Amino acid sequence: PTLEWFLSHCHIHKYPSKSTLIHQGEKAETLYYIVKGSVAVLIKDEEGKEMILSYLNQGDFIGELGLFEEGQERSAWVRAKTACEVAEISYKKFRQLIQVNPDILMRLSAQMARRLQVTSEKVGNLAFLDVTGRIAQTLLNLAKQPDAMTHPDGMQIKITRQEIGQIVGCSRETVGRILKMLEDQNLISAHGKTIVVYGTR
DNA sequence: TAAAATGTGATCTAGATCACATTTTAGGCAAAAAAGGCCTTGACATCCCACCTCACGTATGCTATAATGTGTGCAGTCTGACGCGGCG
Ligand SMILES: Nc1ncnc2c1ncn2[C@@H]1O[C@@H]2COP(=O)(O)O[C@H]2[C@H]1O
């Protein structure tokens, strides 16, 4: 259907894991699409500490904020959650096929609207809640993300203390201690990498 | 000038620090073994085949008082023109 006509035009590259997608500040000259896999968008500070922006699954056009004004840059890092086949688009051609077909910026209305909605409650939560609420609702939303697997009492997922410390804006063993308290509160099971939340659905 | 904004500062309060030992656990590399894919075996079940197989059916033969030329149930006749064979 629609997607067939647009993949008919695209140029593709295969991405290994562990590496960089976007380099912040450089010339933004291409839009991409997640052909297969998952990715983690994030950003550094002056000191170099990472702080995660989000994860992203299938159904995502990628590297879009540079599409629009002449002479823009990359406003964030994007790092490998997994190995990912990824597409290629130029911007003059973006003018061409937005003009002869308006459904792609209808799609990008979809995705970008989701992204500043989810970001709207990212910052909205970033003001007020406490670390309990931060990591709690974090792992709720990751329980909504399809990367988690089904456990017969809920949802299981595999992650370390460091990266969730880079989610909620605090240190890793802090979330370790309140995590073990949360175990003692009987709302999770937890063996090392593999953690599980019940109460889903 | 009504009504919202602006200083008192001492007394606190949930997380970050910070070097180093110990887990784990990947993830991914070598693989043991089991369960399909490959074949076989024994055992069964059902036949196809045909090979027979007797009962019932069927092809054929005579019957010696004597008897000896149909018909047989119909048609109802339409009619005007054209060929042809007699017909003088
Ligand atoms: N708040 C956000 N939500 C989703 N994606 C983002 C956000 N900020 C940056 N990005 C992505 O990170 C990319 C970095 O380079 P760009 O600015 O060209 O395009 C950006 C987006 O694709």
How do the domains of chain A map onto residue ranges? 1-129, 130-201
Q: Which two tokens stand for residue A84?
A: 């990912």
Please report, in angstroms and rounded to a whole number, the separation of the first and last CA atoms in chain A. 33
Does the annotation place A38 within a ligand binding site? no
Sort residue A178 into left (φ over 0), alpha (ψ -120 to 50) or beta. Answer: alpha
Q: Which two tokens stand for residue A103?
A: 């459904």
C-alpha pair distances (Å), A103 with each of A79, A107, A127: 29, 6, 36
Yes or no: domain A130-201 corresponds to CATH 1.10.150.120: no
Kindly state the helix (H) or strand (E) to which residue A194 belongs, with its residue range: strand A194-198
Expt. technique: cryo-EM
Does any ligand 1 atom lie closer than 6 A to the CB of residue A134?
no
Under 8 Å between Cβ of A164 and A175: yes
Name the 3-class secondary structure at A74: coil
Q: Which residues of A101-132 are buried (b: 16+ CB within 10 A; e: fewer)?
A: eeebeeebeeeeeebeeeeeeeeeeeeeeeee
Q: How far apart are CA A141 and CA A117, in angstroms?
A: 13
Residue positions counted in chain A: 201
Q: How far apart are CA A91 and CA A66, in angstroms?
A: 9
Please provide residue A116's backbone torsions phi and psi, each rounded to the nearest 5 degrees.
-90, -15
Instruction: Work out the burial of residue A70: count CB atoms within 10 Å of its CB; fewer than 13 is exposed, 13-18 middle, 19 or more buried.
Output: exposed
Does any ligand 1 atom lie closer than 6 A to the CB of residue A22?
yes
Does any ligand 1 atom lie closer than 6 A to the CB of residue A147?
no
For ligand 1, atom 14, the nearest C-alpha belongs to A76
Q: Which two tokens stand for residue A159?
A: 């992650």
Q: How far apart are CA A31 and CA A129, in angstroms?
A: 35
C-alpha pair distances (Å), A116 with each of A69, A122, A148, A177: 19, 9, 23, 32
C-alpha triplet A142, A178, A195: angle, nearest 5°? 40
Task: Select from A13, A14, A36, A7 the least CA-distant residue to A97.
Answer: A7
- Topology of the domain covering A1-129: Jelly Rolls (2.60.120)
Which residues fall within 8 angstroms of residue A39, CB to CB, at 6 or more apart?
A: A21, A55, A56, A60, A62, A78, A79, A80, A81, A82, A84
C-alpha pair distances (Å), A92 with each of A27, A69, A85, A144: 15, 12, 23, 37
Asked if strand B contacts A65 at the CB level, meaning under 7 A, the answer is no
Under 8 Å between Cβ of A167 and A138: yes
Query: Which strands form A11-15's sheet, in the order they lie side by side?
Result: A11-15, A84-88, A32-36, A61-62
Question: Beta strands A39-43 and A77-79: pairing type?
Answer: antiparallel
CB atoms within 10 A of CB A194: 13
Q: Which two tokens stand for residue A114?
A: 């989701």
- Which nucleotide has its C1' atom closest to residue A175's CA? B15
Query: Resolution, rounded to a tenth of an Å?
Result: 3.9
Under 8 Å between Cβ of A88 and A12: yes
DSSP character for A28? -
- Please tell me the distance between residue A189's alpha carbon and the centre of ligand 1 in angstroms: 34
Q: Which two tokens stand for residue A87?
A: 């597409």
Asked if strand B contacts A131 at the CB level, meaning under 7 A, the answer is yes
Q: How far apart are CA A81 and CA A187, in angstroms?
A: 27
- Which nucleotide has its C1' atom closest to residue A49's CA? B16
Question: Beta strands A51-56 and A20-22: pairing type?
Answer: unpaired
